[PDB]
């Protein structure tokens, strides 16, 4: 599913993402925008290391979910990577909460550093009623 901006904003708020581990909703929106364009079925194979990124937040198979074909992988979210390709994002959110419980926090995603950190991210949630 390809979410519309405000639809996703309200969904994330209902799932308890606003302020989770100090991360504002606008930051989560900026992340999803740059990771997948709000697309839950987005996948990207990384030929260099044989891993694949899955879903709206692009979780890498070497660390977060199990796809069975990634060498030396762990499954920290204890989920099949298939669950991160659903239209319902409940599992993807539970995994995002798991990712930020680590010390790096939101910085775990390189894209956040490049496109969201130190920027005015208000535009991502403006007018959504959140």
UniProtKB/Swiss-Prot annotation:
Q: What top-level branch of life does the organism fall under?
A: Eukaryota
Record-annotated C-type lysozyme domain positions: 1-130
Example GO BP: defense response to bacterium
Q: List the disulfide bonds.
A: 6-128, 30-116, 65-81, 77-95
List the catalytic activities from the record.
Answer: Hydrolysis of (1->4)-beta-linkages between N-acetylmuramic acid and N-acetyl-D-glucosamine residues in a peptidoglycan and between N-acetyl-D-glucosamine residues in chitodextrins
A GO CC annotation recorded here is: extracellular region
Q: Which residues form the active site?
A: 35, 53
Which Gene Ontology molecular function entries are recorded, alphabetically? Answer: identical protein binding; lysozyme activity
Database matches in Pfam families: Lys
Q: Where does the UniProt annotation locate this protein? A: Secreted
The entry's keywords: Amyloid, Amyloidosis, Antimicrobial, Bacteriolytic enzyme, Disease variant, Disulfide bond, Glycosidase, Hydrolase, Secreted, Signal
Q: According to its UniProt record, where is this protein mainly located?
A: secreted
Q: What is its EC number?
A: 3.2.1.17
Task: Tell me the SMART domains matching this sequence.
Answer: LYZ1
**Would you identify the family this protein belongs to, as annotated?**
Belongs to the glycosyl hydrolase 22 family.
Question: Note on file?
Answer: Lysozyme C is capable of both hydrolysis and transglycosylation; it also shows a slight esterase activity. It acts rapidly on both peptide-substituted and unsubstituted peptidoglycan, and slowly on chitin oligosaccharides.
Q: What does this protein do?
A: Lysozymes have primarily a bacteriolytic function; those in tissues and body fluids are associated with the monocyte-macrophage system and enhance the activity of immunoagents.
Which medical condition is this protein associated with?
A: Amyloidosis, hereditary systemic 5: A form of hereditary systemic amyloidosis, a disorder characterized by amyloid deposition in multiple tissues resulting in a wide clinical spectrum. AMYLD5 primarily affects the viscera, and the predominant clinical features are renal dysfunction of varying severity, and intra-abdominal bleeding. Inheritance is autosomal dominant.
* Assembly: Monomer.
Q: What name does this protein carry?
A: Lysozyme C
Q: Which gene encodes it?
A: LYZ
